[PDB]
Amino acid sequence: VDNKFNKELGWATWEIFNLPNLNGVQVKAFIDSLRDDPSQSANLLAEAKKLNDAQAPK
């Protein structure tokens, strides 16, 4: 428990950005969702994994 929710945003931003298939557009989208909800960071990550998976060489 902390008075700085921003930590989650620093957490998810790099996590999402660490996706080998994302682009500044998709990551920022997740980074954008982060601001909209810091607790969702994992979900944004999830969505990121989803976007990355979508942008994957499959």
Question: Are 16 and 48 within 8 A, CB to CB?
Answer: yes
Measured between alpha carbons, how far is 25 from 31 in angstroms, rounded to an integer?
A: 10
Q: Is 47 helix (H, G, I), strand (E, B) or coil?
A: helix
**Long-range own/partner contacts, residues 14-18 (CB < 8 A, 24 or more apart):** 15/41, 15/45, 15/48, 16/44, 16/45, 16/48
* Domains detected in the chain: 1-58 (1.20.5.420)
Experiment used for this model: NMR
Measured between alpha carbons, how far is 42 from 58 in angstroms, rounded to an integer?
A: 23
Q: Which helix (H) or strand (E) holds 10?
A: helix 6-17
Write the CB contacts of 51 (distance below 8 Å, at least 6 apart in sequence). 19, 21, 22, 26, 29, 30
Measured between alpha carbons, how far is 53 from 18 in angstroms, rounded to an integer?
A: 13
Chain centroid to CA 53: how far?
13
